[PDB]
Design a protein around this ligand. Structure first.
Ligand SMILES: Nc1nc2c(ncn2[C@@H]2O[C@H](COP(=O)(O)OP(=O)(O)OP(=O)(O)O)[C@@H](O)[C@H]2O)c(=O)[nH]1
Ligand SMILES: Nc1nc2c(ncn2[C@@H]2O[C@H](COP(=O)(O)OP(=O)(O)OP(=O)(O)O)[C@@H](O)[C@H]2O)c(=O)[nH]1
Ligand SMILES: Nc1nc2c(ncn2[C@@H]2O[C@H](COP(=O)(O)OP(=O)(O)O)[C@@H](O)[C@H]2O)c(=O)[nH]1
Ligand SMILES: Nc1nc2c(ncn2[C@@H]2O[C@H](COP(=O)(O)OP(=O)(O)O)[C@@H](O)[C@H]2O)c(=O)[nH]1
Ligand SMILES: [Mg+2]
Ligand SMILES: [Mg+2]
Ligand SMILES: [Zn+2]
Ligand SMILES: [Zn+2]
Lengths: 48, 47, 23, 442, 43, 430, 442, 430
């Protein structure tokens, strides 16, 4: 049981570290969302 | 006088970039940058 | 470089004299 | 972290050219403000921020203003090699000089130019987040440096208040002289330095000429050499903010350690391994040798002999390959000497600093390359002798109302001469009283 | 004390009274209440 | 046991989009509406928030109302916007103008009947209806006026159910609009009569959460709405999953409100920590409890240390022992006894639920009833008194038709709410 | 969504040319009214609709009228490059001018032309579905601009009622002047502007000349520079209707937030990143820097100093790459300053707007290209000094009836001068009274 | 039985970095924080200084405080720096200015609440709390003022626990700071009331140790701080490993302190010997005892030969006989009997621990309570009276806000401490 709890906690940390909320990125984008960026605007890209 | 004194060594520096000395200033890190980025964002204090 | 107890140690002061920032 | 530099008149702008040349070469900014970012060995670091701000396209621009009443010297800066480094608004120039009249600078002409300068300084101070003082460069012998220096300092005190202002000032040398009216301008600058300045360092060109003749091997020095020495001193003192070290020292620690009473803020400066390239490879330059060097009067950058007074505090900045144990052994040997005396109310006379960055070598420069250096600023009662000779020369001329017509016609009451001379006399008496031993105890 | 209080030389360090200086100048409000004649014309 | 959601104004519609993303993710509903989940536990309570339309699809029980269609274009552009039923979007053709009286009296009465018709259509389809959930800001124009109008109408039609609101209130420090105090005062007057339980959030507290705890370099309103959507989806979790000690919105209300005006609550959510720090701390019940009571983690500007707790509630999600929960609540009650109102012998309710939010091993949400909430209303009343003494902007409201006596009545009601909290703070046994 | 522009006389038509060049270039409409047939961006967006309507043939045509009493300027528009853009009915021209007489415009000549103007406005208002105000450009110094502008605003105010009317007005500069009779026309104008406008923005050419000399590097500016600046300001205020953003602001929110009492509707305007291309590479231009810029009096487009009054409300429009947190930090920094003062009855002094579309760059233009800009409109008691100089100049001239026979011959009672002068005096006293502290509670 | 550490100022953070390197090395913790040790004996007492983070890792129970983050960035940048929890670094925005009054009154009161919150959070997590451990210098600015402020707050909140300090004091020959007498006097005034046990080290004594005993050619602060970290880690060894005669900080205090003001101690560590000489002499209990009592090996400038020992303690590490300890301590007391206070029949406590520091067969740490400490205080008081009589730098402190009465109170209290030591020096049986 101890080993199982350890594995679940490691999966927890791996989920938080790779998530999009803390990394400030977005992956689920709608086609209309590529033009309208009402909330989710954060800044300009390098190419711009 | 300013030409022959300062502009000559300025031109020499323009020609040669190996005269700039190396250094180490590890005291400038992430907490200093955090304090730099947080100017004017004071919130939730009691007086 | 020797510790006060006799063991070897790594450098602790940077080597800067005679060095250049840009290759 | 950041510091703002204010350059006034001819000496201050010319010393500024050497200072900013040095600070560029020390940080690694090219003369056009760029940086060869792709050719690098180490990693890019924030240390420039004390003196530079970035636009974001990676150009660097410096935190300075240049103030003059004649255009020619600033136009020389505008047309030189560093043309692209400075923002054009920072280089401020008037129409006509203060003609060696303090009154002309202070009342009539500087009042027109002063509001642009204050607006630029405000624009700099708004782009800061931990400003810890102003550095001011001026000469008190000329008209615009004295008068506009005084007015700007007075306005800054009301606007910024408690924020510190540290001045490096070229005072009139005790027998080399350049203009007749130097005593009036130097006297009438007494109030500004006495009441609106936190530490003032005094320099005389005759001492730097003596140092460059004796130690360096230069037969025919010119102002660029003196300005390069001043730039080296300033770089040594500000290195403690910018680079790693064993014992760091923030600019507020100088003020805490050097000034015992609020008027006693005038300090002497000296620098140790002033040496030529041919001599430098014949000699070792150990810590104890340069520590012994800084106390000899042949090393000083002000024409005063400290043997005629008593030390109150010393602040010693070591940079380069030095080990603290050698600094302690050197300071204990200095303390042993019989010709060095401290006032009995100051038992713990020393402050130390130790920094790892060795002094930089400038391609056209005249100093040798050396692994270590030490720089000292110290407060001593011997300075009272410097004021007395100016007061004697002032007393000579004012007695016959020799040139008073210029100042009274251009707007000054005759009373102001007597006022300034009595205030500096009281400052001399303060320096006499503070230095008197408390031998009467019971 | 043994020095001068800086009211000489014609300088003062007292902070301005912002509320008084901030009120505007008007013909009836300011100019008409003066012993010596005053006018909003630019010299 | 079905909840109906109402989203009003820009803030409400934006928070709603994130709320419905979180709920659709937890039940494994694709943004097309198709079920793609992998356990029966997801399906067996899907009815609580979704209705099932024919051939697979699920539709979310929400009404969207706004005075300018700009928001509809913003929600339609989001990643989940397609899921919403077209007939549920109600909009006008001109804005509220940031004016409470306009939003309440002129365009409000024009639109409100179609909103009540949609809400009734949604309510009467449920086999048994649980409370309503409403998101809006109090500082706005259509949010305050039309939200409180609709709340009053729903309170007329369903007085025995629960009325729940999440509400954003103007910061003392940062504002986007000048006339915030009038709209806030009138809205607080409406809420204290109509609501059963009200949660208050300061945008300043969400910015301070983001900057200090999460160390985000460039936070956006999406982050604030994610924090809010997290707590909103957490409060209902025990309604819709199994657990060792079930709980319900009505049991929370019964345990939190001693007297019917004292229905204003504090919010918190415990597992918040920066990506750099996450490697440094393993999950455990003491850590969650410690973060849960830290005022740093509370979503209002008022701090509990300036007040006293009447009651509090904690809802735990995850597989954990009941002994640790009970003994933690005992230890916190015993060590800080001066901060708890003494004429109630035990102030904390606990509840335990088996199913955590996705990607977290455990979570707790905290609801607190503390008298220091009176300080927020006092600040709003101060700014109102500064403007009102000089009739600073009143002609807009009077031109809509309001009597000036209305402003003094609303001010008096807020002052009485502050007085009642202060009196219960300083009560004693004797 | 829609707004209709009315341009009157010489200044209003010339400013119209700059406005419509900019609005065409910003949307991408060619000067002939046809969008590029090969430019398939992918989604034909509705943003033009605020300023253009389509002719069903797919040409775009703009929602404007050009009004003049002399033919020359409108015939110049008719023969220029944009001939095909405008509908020919929109360009209305009379035969002969109002000869610098307000009386001639109001009574004699504008009465003939006004009904054509009303028919065009009727035809425009019928082709709308969410009209939300009129923008009016005119100068009050000339005869037709004052007289016909007043008459037309009166007729619009009776016919349309509650619909908003926002004016951009060229006021007489405090010492630069172009005609002798300016005080009479400005006094007679102000009664109508007081009664028949919802917000009035005041402009002085002398301020825009100072701004173009100081900020831009132009030694010899002409009206096209000023008109391009005005066009940029109008585009900034109307950008909130036309492009995506975080916090939109409809013109009624502007009117609700900016106007505290129904007579207190005269506002100051300023614009931040007026900068040349060569200056643009020495400085970053962050949100806080341009926010600090809009509050300096050197940035204003009207010759008044706001330090001599108190702010009641400010509306700040940001366009381009800005994040709300930076706007909040900037506004929090502004609030600390002591030389910026708000009336104690206005605690929440600011309104914000944030739009993502950066300002457009015009090929022949003199402004640099910049990633962000801010525009401010603010209501302040400082305006009372502005009225006082016209009242003094009117009193000086009217004491001898210097020109009155022209006005009496063209149809005006002599009594009308005194009535208008007393009404402007009461408005001056209102601005004196509103700024008086509430010492009633003592 | 777990300790919470506080490190303050530049000296404190630098000494702390070496201490946590030494502690992590003895327990086999990688600089990433991962346990890589090779015996269960390492794990079974890891709780004393480390908290356990998930899947292996351990984190050190320490608070880092400074007024400018430059030092914090230097410590974070060090080779073991990663182990420290990011949230545990507390810093302000402006310096102490090397001024005690600034550190105590202006920036102290600004930061202290966040430090007290972190220290309480760390303390209340412990199942049973042992004393606090604090490292700082008295001559500095933020170290002296804020360290003594924090000590006073912790003494208010935890008066029944132990308060322990390690402190650096100005050398008699060369000053590092001009205003050292004021900061030292005020700090000693605070400590003598607040502290339970205080250890003192002179940098001059470490230089003399290095040069005379170790013959090091080019010593650096890393060597001095390594010697200090060695003794610091030695004092706690019996807390955290088995032995024939266990010992504890409270047992040390009870045996060392006869009266509550007499709590200032000298330190030494015995098996110091140069790499060239080490081949010539094996370790044994007589060799350790002889070096241990040699004044050459003592870390203060005062010499025992000018005073008398009230009490002493020796902690032995290694596999060793009880005969050598008992008979050596008796033999040393008998042969040098004039240097031991005669009205206590046995002045030395011994303790024995099985596990030596790595690479030494045996070690002892010595703690001594000796009246020669009065000479240091007398020297500091003389230099203070010379400076104070002339108002030498007083305007800085008075401008911060201090009343002059504080200086006369602190001087009088320190002078009474010197008198009390002198009185116990010359006491007799009669
Ligand atoms: N060390 C040094 N001294 C200088 C330099 N330039 C001028 N001085 C000295 O400063 C004094 C002259 O002051 P100036 O700077 O020329 O006076 P100013 O500020 O130009 O005042 P005006 O003449 O009224 O314009 C003399 O004693 C010069 O020797 C310089 O570049 N370096
Ligand atoms: N900024 C700006 N000001 C202008 C422009 N044209 C004229 N003015 C100013 O406006 C005032 C003159 O008003 P006008 O427009 O010439 O008067 P009008 O409308 O032609 O009236 P009439 O002379 O009767 O035809 C003067 O102060 C001019 O400086 C312009 O194109 N731009
Ligand atoms: N937390 C949060 N606040 C918001 C959001 N949108 C707007 N606001 C705030 O709400 C206030 C504006 O009210 P708004 O919703 O536009 O009122 P409405 O026009 O009646 O809908 C301002 O203080 C905004 O900062 C959001 O998505 N999240
Ligand atoms: N042993 C030791 N002493 C130090 C170290 N760093 C500074 N010191 C001493 O501590 C004193 C300076 O105090 P400091 O830490 O700078 O005070 P602060 O400014 O308040 O942080 C001087 O006596 C220094 O010699 C160190 O790493 N080791
Ligand atoms: Mg000159
Ligand atoms: Mg005309
Ligand atoms: Zn002064
Ligand atoms: Zn006049």
């Amino acid at each position: 049981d101890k080993e199982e709890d350890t594995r679940k906690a490691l999966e927890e940390i791996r989920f938080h570290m790779e998530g999009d909320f803390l990394n400030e990125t977005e992956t689920v984008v709608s086609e209309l969302g590529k033009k309208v960026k009402a909330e989710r605007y954060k800044g300009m890209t390098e190419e711009q | 006088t300013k030409n022959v004194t300062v502009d000559a060594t300025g031109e020499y520096l323009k020609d040669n970039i190996d005269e700039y000395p190396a250094t180490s200033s590890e005291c400038w890190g992430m907490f200093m940058k955090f304090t730099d980025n947080m100017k004017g964002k004071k919130l939730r204090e009691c007086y | 470089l020797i510790d006060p107890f006799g063991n070897p140690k790594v450098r602790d002061v940077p080597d800067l004299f005679g060095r250049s920032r840009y290759s | 972290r950041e510091a703002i530099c204010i350059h006034i008149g001819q000496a201050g702008c010319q010393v500024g050219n050497a200072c900013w040349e040095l600070f560029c070469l020390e940080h690694g900014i090219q003369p056009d403000g760029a940086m060869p970012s792709d050719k690098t060995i180490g990693v890019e670091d924030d240390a420039f921020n004390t003196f530079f701000s970035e636009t974001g396209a990676g150009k660097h621009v410096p935190r300075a203003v240049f103030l003059d009443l004649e255009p020619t010297v600033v136009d020389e800066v505008r047309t030189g090699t560093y043309r692209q480094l400075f923002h054009p608004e920072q280089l401020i120039s008037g129409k006509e000089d203060a003609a060696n009249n303090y009154a002309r600078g202070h009342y009539t002409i500087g009042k027109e130019i002063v509001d642009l300068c204050l607006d630029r300084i405000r624009k700099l101070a708004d782009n800061c987040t931990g400003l810890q003082g102003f550095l001011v460069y001026h000469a008190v012998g000329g008209g615009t440096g004295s008068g506009l220096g005084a007015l700007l300092l007075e306005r800054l005190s009301v606007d910024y208040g408690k924020k510190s202002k540290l001045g490096y000032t070229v005072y009139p040398s005790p027998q080399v002289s350049t203009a007749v009216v130097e005593p009036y301008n130097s006297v009438l600058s007494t109030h500004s330095l006495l009441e609106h300045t936190d530490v003032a360092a005094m320099l005389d060109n005759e001492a730097i000429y003596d140092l460059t003749r004796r130690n360096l091997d230069i037969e025919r020095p010119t102002y660029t050499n003196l300005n390069r020495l001043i730039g080296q001193v300033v770089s040594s003192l500000t290195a403690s903010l910018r680079f790693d070290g064993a014992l760091n020292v923030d600019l507020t620690e100088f003020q805490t350690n050097l000034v015992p009473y609020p008027r006693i803020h005038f300090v002497l400066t000296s620098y140790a391994p002033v040496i030529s390239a041919e001599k430098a490879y014949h000699e070792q330059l150990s810590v104890s040798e340069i520590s012994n060097a800084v106390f000899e009067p042949a090393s000083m950058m002000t024409k005063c002999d400290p043997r005629h007074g008593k030390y109150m505090a010393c602040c010693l900045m070591y940079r380069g390959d030095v080990v603290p144990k050698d600094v302690n052994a050197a300071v204990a040997t200095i303390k042993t000497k019989r010709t060095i005396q401290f006032v009995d109310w100051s038992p713990t006379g020393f402050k130390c600093g130790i920094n790892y960055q060795p002094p930089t070598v400038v391609p056209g420069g005249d100093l040798a390359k050396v692994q270590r250096a030490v720089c000292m600023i110290a407060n001593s009662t011997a300075i009272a002798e410097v004021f007395a000779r100016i007061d004697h020369k002032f007393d000579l001329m004012y007695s016959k109302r020799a040139f008073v017509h210029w100042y009274v016609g251009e707007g000054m009451e005759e009373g102001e001469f007597s006022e300034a001379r009595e205030d500096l006399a009281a400052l001399e008496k303060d320096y006499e009283e503070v230095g008197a031993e408390s031998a009467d105890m019971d | 004390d043994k020095y001068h209080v800086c009211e000489c030389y014609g300088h003062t360090q007292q902070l301005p009274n912002y509320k008084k200086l901030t009120n505007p100048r008007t013909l009836q409000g300011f100019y008409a209440k003066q012993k010596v004649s005053a006018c909003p014309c630019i010299p | 046991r079905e909840i109906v959601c109402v989203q009003a104004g820009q803030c409400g519609n934006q928070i709603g989009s994130k709320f419905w993303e979180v709920i659709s993710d937890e039940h494994g509903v694709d943004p097309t509406g198709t079920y793609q989940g992998d356990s029966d536990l997801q399906l067996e309570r899907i009815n609580v928030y979704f209705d099932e339309a024919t051939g697979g699809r699920y539709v979310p029980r929400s009404v969207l109302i706004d005075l300018e269609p700009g928001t509809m274009d913003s929600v339609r552009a989001g990643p989940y916007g397609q899921i919403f039923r077209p007939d549920n979007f109600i909009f006008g053709q001109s804005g509220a103008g940031n004016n409470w009286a306009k939003g309440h009296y002129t365009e409000g009465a024009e639109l409100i009947d179609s909103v009540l018709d949609v809400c009734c259509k949604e309510a009467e389809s449920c086999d048994c209806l649980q409370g309503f959930q409403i998101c809006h800001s109090l500082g706005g124009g259509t949010g305050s006026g039309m939200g409180t109008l609709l709340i009053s109408k729903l309170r007329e039609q369903y007085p025995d159910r629960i009325m729940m609101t999440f509400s954003i209130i103007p910061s003392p420090k940062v504002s986007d609009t000048v006339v915030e105090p009038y709209n806030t005062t009138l809205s607080v007057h409406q809420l204290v009569e109509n609501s059963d339980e009200s949660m208050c959030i300061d945008n300043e507290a969400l910015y301070d959460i983001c900057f200090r705890t999460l160390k985000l370099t460039t936070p956006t309103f999406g982050d604030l709405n994610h924090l809010v959507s997290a707590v909103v989806s957490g409060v209902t979790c025990c309604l819709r999953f199994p657990g060792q000690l079930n709980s319900d919105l009505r049991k929370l209300a019964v345990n939190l409100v001693p007297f019917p005006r004292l229905h204003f609550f504090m919010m918190g959510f415990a597992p918040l920590t920066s990506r750099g720090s996450q490697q440094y701390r393993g999950l455990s019940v003491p850590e969650l409890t410690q973060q849960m009571f830290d005022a740093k983690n509370m979503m209002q500007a008022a701090d509990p240390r300036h007040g006293r707790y009447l009651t509090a509630s904690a809802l735990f999600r995850g597989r954990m022992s009941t002994k640790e929960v009970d003994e933690q609540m005992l230890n916190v009650q015993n060590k800080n006894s001066s901060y708890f109102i003494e004429w109630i012998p035990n102030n904390i309710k606990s509840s335990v639920c088996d199913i955590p939010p996705k990607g977290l091993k455990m979570a707790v949400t905290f609801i607190g009833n503390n008298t220091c909430i009176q300080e927020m209303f006092r600040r709003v009343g101060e700014q109102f008194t500064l403007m009102f003494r000089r009739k600073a902007f009143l002609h807009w409201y009077t031109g809509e038709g309001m009597d000036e006596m209305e402003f003094t009545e609303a001010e008096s009601n807020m002052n009485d709410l502050v007085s009642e909290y202060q009196q219960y703070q300083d009560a004693t046994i004797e």
